[PDB]
Each structure stands twice: as structure tokens, then as C-alpha cells.
Amino acid sequence: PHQVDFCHVPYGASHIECSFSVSFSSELRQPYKCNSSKVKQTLVQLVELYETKIGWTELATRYLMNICNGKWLWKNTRKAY
């Protein structure tokens, strides 16, 4: 009962859609918990000063690149037209 599975594209299938939904959100601005506010300040200020000095464009770009090229389609693009 090892039950190995096999998912292959059906015969006449023209192509294959892969849908998902990714949500970016500003939940990194404030730590979800800090039992010591003294460290919460040095992280919210860390985030603020990061954003001011080196803007979000690098992390945002490196995320949106993985979104916009097929990289979430992990191996399903090795043999794709």
C-alpha cells in the first residue's frame, strides 16, 4: 500500500492553467509580539530607517520577480514550451 501517484497532462489538453493569489501586506512594520517594548522600538525604527535609507525596491523587486516568472511553478517548467 505505498500508493504512488501520477499526474500527467491529459491527452487532448491544449494547455494548463495554474492559478493562485499572493497578498503582500504591511505586517512587518510592527512585531506581532514583544514582551519587552525596548526591543520593539529598535525593530520598528529599524524598519523605518531601512525603508527611508534603502527603499523597498530591492526586496519588492526580488519578490515580484519570483511571482512574475514561473518560479512558484517549481519543476513544472523544466519541459515547457
Binding site for other proteins (CB under 8 A): 27-28, 32, 42-43, 45-47, 49-50, 52-54, 58-59, 78
CB of 68 to other proteins, least distance (A): 16
CA 24 to chain centre: 8
Q: How far is the CB of 50 from other proteins (least distance, A)?
A: 6
Least Å from the CB of residue 16 to other proteins: 19
Q: Contact at 8 Å (CB) between 16 and 9?
A: yes
Question: Angle CA(21)–CA(18)–CA(72) in degrees, nearest 5?
Answer: 70
Of 19 and 52, which has the nearer Cβ to other proteins?
52
Rounded Cα–Cα distance for residues 55 and 72 (Å): 25
Cβ distance to other proteins smaller for residue 19 or 79: 79
